[PDB]
Amino acid sequence: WPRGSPALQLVVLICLGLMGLERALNVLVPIFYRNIVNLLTEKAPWNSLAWTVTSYVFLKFLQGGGTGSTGFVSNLRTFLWIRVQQFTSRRVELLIFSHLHELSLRWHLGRRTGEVLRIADRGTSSVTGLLSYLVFNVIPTLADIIIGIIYFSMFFNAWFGLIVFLCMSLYLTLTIVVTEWRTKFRRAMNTQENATRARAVDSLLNFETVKYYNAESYEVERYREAIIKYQGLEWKSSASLVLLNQTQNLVIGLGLLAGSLLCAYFVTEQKLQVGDYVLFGTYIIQLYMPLNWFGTYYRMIQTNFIDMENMFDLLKEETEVKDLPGAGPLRFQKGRIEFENVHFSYADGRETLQDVSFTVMPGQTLALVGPSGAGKSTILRLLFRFYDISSGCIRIDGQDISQVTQASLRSHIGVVPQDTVLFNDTIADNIRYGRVTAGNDEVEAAAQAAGIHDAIMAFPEGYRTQVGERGLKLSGGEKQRVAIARTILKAPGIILLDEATSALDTSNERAIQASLAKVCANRTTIVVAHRLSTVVNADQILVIKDGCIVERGRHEALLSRGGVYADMWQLQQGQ
Amino acid sequence: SPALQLVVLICLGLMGLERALNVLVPIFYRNIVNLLTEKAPWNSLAWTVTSYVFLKFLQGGGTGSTGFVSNLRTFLWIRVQQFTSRRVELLIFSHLHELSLRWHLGRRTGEVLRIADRGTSSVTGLLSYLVFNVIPTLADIIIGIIYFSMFFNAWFGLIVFLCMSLYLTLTIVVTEWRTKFRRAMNTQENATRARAVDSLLNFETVKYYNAESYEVERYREAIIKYQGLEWKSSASLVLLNQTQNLVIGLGLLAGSLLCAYFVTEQKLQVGDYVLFGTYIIQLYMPLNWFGTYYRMIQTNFIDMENMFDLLKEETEVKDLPGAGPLRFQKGRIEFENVHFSYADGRETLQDVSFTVMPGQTLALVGPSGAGKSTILRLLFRFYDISSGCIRIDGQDISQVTQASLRSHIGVVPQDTVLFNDTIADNIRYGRVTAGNDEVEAAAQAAGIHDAIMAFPEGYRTQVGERGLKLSGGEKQRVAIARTILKAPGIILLDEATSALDTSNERAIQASLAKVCANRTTIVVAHRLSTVVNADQILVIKDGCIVERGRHEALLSRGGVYADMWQLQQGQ
Ligand SMILES: CC1=C(CCC(=O)O)c2cc3nc(cc4[nH]c(cc5[nH]c(cc1n2)c(C)c5CCC(=O)O)c(CCC(=O)O)c4C)C(CCC(=O)O)=C3C
Ligand SMILES: CC(C)CCC[C@@H](C)[C@H]1CC[C@H]2[C@@H]3CC=C4C[C@@H](OC(=O)CCC(=O)O)CC[C@]4(C)[C@H]3CC[C@]12C
Ligand SMILES: CC(C)CCC[C@@H](C)[C@H]1CC[C@H]2[C@@H]3CC=C4C[C@@H](OC(=O)CCC(=O)O)CC[C@]4(C)[C@H]3CC[C@]12C
């Protein structure tokens, strides 16, 4: 009974009560069947016979069969049951997805997505299967066991309660032990299956060397051997399944035989009448064709057990590198940035962070162009709250970044990337993606402010186009102009920027760095680059060898100094 | 094999016995109730009841928790599908290595074997379908109609005639409705995970935008649309099962009321209602699985047509005009005047010109790049020549069979890949005809024995992805071991000599002298020893010969050749 919405409470309650009705008509259908046989044994009036027989046939319509042609009640149960499985499935999928995008960058670098999204989806499938399995299979079939014991031990002869109770115990125990034994065979068949498939696929994939040494004949022979070995073990596993099913049938056979003969004895001794015998025979088979399906669901709870703990592990792994639990906002006015004893160990990088101390001028442009290596992108990520400070003081406008909180940061800050990574979507969403809660007419206004109008008329249908892998393919300058529309919509306090090594054409280049100067106006920027035009518009440059600051000044100061920037400028002057 | 003829004969007979059980178990049930309603002599009653319960054990309910004969047919039928699965799998794999590289290098091996196992599973599922569900359930329908028709009054044959024909007809029309919902479904599943995985990939730009609220709201919107489609899915399936259920109910109701009327009128006996009331459920419950197999038939037949597509086709790059044997005896190497057409590249053959008699080791050199193995792929009959003649030992390669040239040539690539196995089958892999004494004798004779015995397991070491991981020089020496135990008539070589260890490079060159002990080789390399080893050296620029002459002649010519050699050697 989830407390989400009152409609869902009523669907849950009506489906539970409807389950109760099905487990109630489980006993009525045999009881009616016995009454019909008694009406036919000694003669009955047709007028009452017809109504009782029709009443029975509609009750057997309500439950056509056990797990096959389940019947009106079970079918109506399953159709209304999905409308709470949608709720719980949707809720857990949203929660796990929010947690996946909660986790930090360092989690997301190496491990992929489809190897994790499968874990999420199969975990949701596992929990839905667990609740549906349990509530509709464990408690109902155990309830049927209690009703069989109770009803045959009260209203029919007590030793048939004995035969049924013993037969249920013999069946359930035998089923679970041979399911374990079959389980060890399942794993044994699976491990060889991996080997036969692996040898096959690599023997094919090495076609160059198979061709190189005439290896088709021996390759056929060894693949046939792997097939024969897999066959000779699959025979063993399927013989185990055969023995399991056959002894399930043999225990049902002994249980039915004991009851049928004992009932025959009591009916011939006339303590019971023929209807009671027909009831016993039809009630056992009804009681068991669910139950062989119970064993199947107990061997498909094994996969669920592995998925659920894995789902719980992913759900409970949160980096939580730094945050202020009091939700303390940011008080930002100009862009005063502080460097003092800023040291941090960096993983998987040639450069590291080694005691940098050079505050940037607020309102000005202090670029960082220098050596090969992604330490510039590293300090960009570090300033953009992606890695923990080990030792250092970072004070945007005079307050520590560890306690001013991330929502206030990303409201107060806006940073563009170097590779515009875009979806298979429209363009209107990707230009309003800077501020999704901003109106359309102003996002066309900011798009024309970026200059995106030219691609709009280049589109087959303009601002309502489809762009991506499932849409049209734009160019890099177009997409970076979408990105600058994103950031001017996002209204930054401080802009940080990077580019790749690609410039499309001079006509778009002059426009895009004109707009870069426009957005860097009234803003401090610490830009990183490898493009001469995006370096010369910035005045003062910081160059860092291996995490520590080494040169200083402006670009002509570096040229007269003769540093690595001067060598790069000579190399770009004459290639 | 004739034993499998015995297994299939006993399997068809076992199906026949299983059809007999289906009519007999209810006829026995009617007899037990008959003997029960009038007063029963026990000593016939007890034996008839246990005879029935024996027979009901053999049948094992309807289907699901299947009976003795069904499990026996399923068990002993494995021995036949194993045969046809193994045979058609070997047919695929033989004709798929025998298929040319041209389609094969354009395909990835993960999906081709996926299609192969899917096609084989399709063939066995389809044949088990067609002889174990189609003919059986149709046979059971006929026996039900005939039994209730001729052995009873005609109207019950009427009822079950109409009920099976109607049940199957309704199951058809509703299963194509369900199928059109299923395809609209599964394309919307394709959307609903594509946008999920793209969001997870674009996480970084999301984090710069702080757009996680927007992306979870877009996700939950399109998953709500998914939920609506799921609801329509299950409502369709519920209508299918419930309409079936209504047909079951209509047949049972019509029969039960009609039977009750006849047994009140005593044209039918009191057992006969129990006969019909159990028998029509016994017919009905397998037919619930028949819609499952009319839904299997679609996937089955599209994959098995895919199997005939990929199998009965050919690529067959090397045509067999005369398919003759080569008159090779000493090994003249002859490239002359071939204009071979080539696309998606610049490596057409614009009449390269070099030939060597036996007694002349041959070289090749040109620009940078790994495309020089195209010449060797042309050399070992992977692509036929358009216009011109290529000879080996004076014999043109355009008319002989492929296997006549396949054996005689020893080529070592840059990396002969070592399998996930021992080294016994690795030295067996060079050539299989020889014995253990001479393959480990050539293992000592090729200088791999030192590190084989230096490794802590010796000749039986487990090596590869399923074993230990070796080194590049050792596996190159393994390739040299394979070709020196192969003992091919003439050797066309490629050589790594990747300057890792100088001692192993000297072992490589000693192996080179031993494998070229008065026999010719052609070498594609850019290192000093492996270029001065050959008698003459030709420069080829994508099929264009530009300079020929020895190492000192080319270095005295001194152009792009000498500057790339000296810039590679030093800086
Ligand atoms: C009635 C029924 C449901 C619905 C009830 C419920 O869901 O609660 C169900 C669910 C599922 N069945 C599933 C998968 C499979 N079940 C198979 C095989 C079988 N199904 C059977 C019965 C059922 N199974 C049985 C007695 C067999 C053996 C005979 C045969 O082989 O027909 C096969 C092999 C097919 C082949 O070998 O041809 C597969 C791949 C999946 C996973 C997702 C998917 O793959 O759809 C799920 C949730
Ligand atoms: C939350 C869920 C698990 C509740 C499920 C409850 C049902 C499994 C039980 C509860 C009470 C049971 C009923 C209690 C008493 C009877 C009367 C009983 O008939 C008689 O008393 C005599 C019949 C005869 O003469 O043979 C038939 C079964 C029935 C309807 C039972 C059917 C099964 C019921 C509904
Ligand atoms: C919703 C669709 C699937 C139609 C379902 C129809 C049933 C609900 C109807 C059709 C046949 C009807 C039966 C036809 C005949 C009789 C006998 C009748 O008894 C008599 O009057 C005897 C003489 C005679 O019927 O001519 C009592 C009602 C009953 C059981 C009827 C009960 C209601 C039934 C089952």
Ligand SMILES: CC(C)CCC[C@@H](C)[C@H]1CC[C@H]2[C@@H]3CC=C4C[C@@H](OC(=O)CCC(=O)O)CC[C@]4(C)[C@H]3CC[C@]12C
């Ligand atoms: C090829 C595959 C599909 C198997 C087909 C089997 C049928 C051709 C046969 C084999 C044994 C037959 C059964 C053998 C004996 C009987 C008893 C017979 O009982 C009688 O009352 C008839 C004789 C009499 O009048 O005394 C009714 C038919 C039945 C069940 C037969 C039904 C048809 C069966 C199943």
Ligand SMILES: CC(C)CCC[C@@H](C)[C@H]1CC[C@H]2[C@@H]3CC=C4C[C@@H](OC(=O)CCC(=O)O)CC[C@]4(C)[C@H]3CC[C@]12C
């Ligand atoms: C497959 C393995 C696990 C053994 C299964 C046991 C059956 C083969 C046995 C157990 C119950 C036995 C039955 C128990 C009672 C009787 C009644 C008996 O009738 C009599 O004449 C003796 C009793 C009397 O006097 O009424 C004839 C043998 C029979 C059918 C037996 C036949 C053989 C049965 C079915």
Ligand SMILES: CC(C)CCC[C@@H](C)[C@H]1CC[C@H]2[C@@H]3CC=C4C[C@@H](OC(=O)CCC(=O)O)CC[C@]4(C)[C@H]3CC[C@]12C
């Ligand atoms: C959609 C599927 C379920 C087919 C439905 C067919 C029924 C609507 C038909 C087929 C058989 C018909 C019956 C065939 C025979 C009889 C017996 C007949 O009366 C006699 O012949 C009595 C003879 C005697 O006194 O022994 C009256 C009509 C009736 C009930 C028919 C009523 C209409 C029935 C049930």
